[PDB]
Amino acid sequence: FTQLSQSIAEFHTYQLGNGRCSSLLAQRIHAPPETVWSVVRRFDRPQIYKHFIKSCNVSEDFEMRVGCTRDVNVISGLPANTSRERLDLLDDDRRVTGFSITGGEHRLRNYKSVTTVHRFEKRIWTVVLESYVVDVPEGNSEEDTRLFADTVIRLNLQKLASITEAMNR
Amino acid sequence: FTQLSQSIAEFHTYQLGNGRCSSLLAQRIHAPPETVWSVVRRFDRPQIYKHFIKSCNVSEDFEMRVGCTRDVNVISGLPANTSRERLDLLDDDRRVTGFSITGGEHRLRNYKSVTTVHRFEKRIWTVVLESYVVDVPEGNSEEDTRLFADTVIRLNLQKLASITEAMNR
Numbered sequence: 648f649t650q651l652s653q654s655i656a657e658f659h660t661y662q663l664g665n666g667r668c669s670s671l672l673a674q675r676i677h678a679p680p681e682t683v684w685s686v687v688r689r690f691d692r693p694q695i696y697k698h699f700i701k702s703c704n705v706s707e708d709f710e711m712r713v714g715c716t717r718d719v720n721v722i723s724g725l726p727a728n729t730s731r732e733r734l735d736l737l738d739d740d741r742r743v744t745g746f747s748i749t750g751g752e753h754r755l756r757n758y759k760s761v762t763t764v765h766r767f768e769k770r771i772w773t774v775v776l777e778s779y780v781v782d783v784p785e786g787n788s789e790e791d792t793r794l795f796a797d798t799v800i801r802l803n804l805q806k807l808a809s810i811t812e813a814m815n816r
Numbered sequence: 817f818t819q820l821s822q823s824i825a826e827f828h829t830y831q832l833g834n835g836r837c838s839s840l841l842a843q844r845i846h847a848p849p850e851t852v853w854s855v856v857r858r859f860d861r862p863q864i865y866k867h868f869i870k871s872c873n874v875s876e877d878f879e880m881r882v883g884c885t886r887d888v889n890v891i892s893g894l895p896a897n898t899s900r901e902r903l904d905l906l907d908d909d910r911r912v913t914g915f916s917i918t919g920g921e922h923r924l925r926n927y928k929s930v931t932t933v934h935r936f937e938k939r940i941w942t943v944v945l946e947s948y949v950v951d952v953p954e955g956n957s958e959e960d961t962r963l964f965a966d967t968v969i970r971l972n973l974q975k976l977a978s979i980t981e982a983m984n985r
């Protein structure tokens with residue numbers, strides 16, 4: 648579909664800068680795009696569809712805008728860490744959102760990620776695209792970093808499929 | 817079952833001295849217990865149903881009974897490091913297997929795991945029980961440790977369910 652390819656060219660294509668790496672993942676979901684997007688868009692509640700989140704805190708006066716932040720307490724490695732994340736992009740009409748990890752996540756330094764939600768018709772189904780660019784830690788190989796980031800995104804997208812399909816019922 | 821409770825008593829109960837924690841998880845599978853066991857028993861190939869395994873290698877003269885070892889490279893996001901895991905127990909008649917993590921930096925300390933697979937009716941279904949005991953060093957959090965381990969095991973058990981249910985459908 649052209650809308651898909653246009654989204655990939657605008658939001659999921661990347662420069663191959665040195666010490667950087669990126670990837671793009673896709674998840675078909677048997678649920679309407681509005682439901683999937685209503686979950687995907689809530690920057691303050693990523694635990695609804697992500698794994699390994701002990702908790703996520705936002706300021707007492709939180710309002711979702713570009714530049715708003717969250718603290719994500721992560722327990723996917725056992726000295727728990729607090730990922731500091733910043734909303735880069737939110738467009739409800741285009742169903743696109745994006746965030747950055749500014750600090751607190753030594754495995755994903757200068758992580759930047761974009762998620763887009765697409766409608767497909769035949770029964771109205773959804774395809775979610777999720778991509779990222781991130782530093783390769785100097786001692787790391789690229790494939791280690793991508794393997795880690797890919798594995799996590801794949802599991803989270805599976806959980807998102809599962810929870811939105813249960814919602815749609 | 818009586819068999820289920822006895823297997824729990826024998827293999828999934830632990831003593832509670834602090835600096836150690838334990839947990840039991842259950843997974844229900846709509847597949848025959850011999851199929852599930854045929855998968856679970858494969859000590860040399862945990863990549864079949866476990867997440868976060870980049871690779872797993874065994875000696876060229878490998879033979880699988882108690883005391884043999886496997887080398888697993890874990891997808892942790894940290895620099896690549898090989899871990900050594902040891903087959904603690906294996907009974908094909910009782911459908912019980914178990915292993916210990918004996919080596920590996922930035923891994924869990926003294927992690928010990930046991931998996932039993934149980935027949936059930938009331939078309940044949942299966943319950944898989946998996947438990948672990950693991951260290952919690954005086955600086956670490958037991959809450960976080962159980963969150964981490966339980967999430968991993970629950971994901972692995974879901975993949976095992978999916979894979980064994982795909983077999984012969």
Ligand SMILES: ON(O)c1cc(Br)cc(N(O)O)c1NS(O)(O)c1ccc(Br)cc1
Nearest residue numbers: 723724868890891892922923924965968969
């Ligand atoms: O799944 N798995 O082995 C794993 C997954 C991620 Br992500 C990171 C790590 N490291 O190495 O931090 C590990 N290794 S482990 O923490 O020693 C570990 C052993 C058993 C159980 Br249950 C949970 C964790």
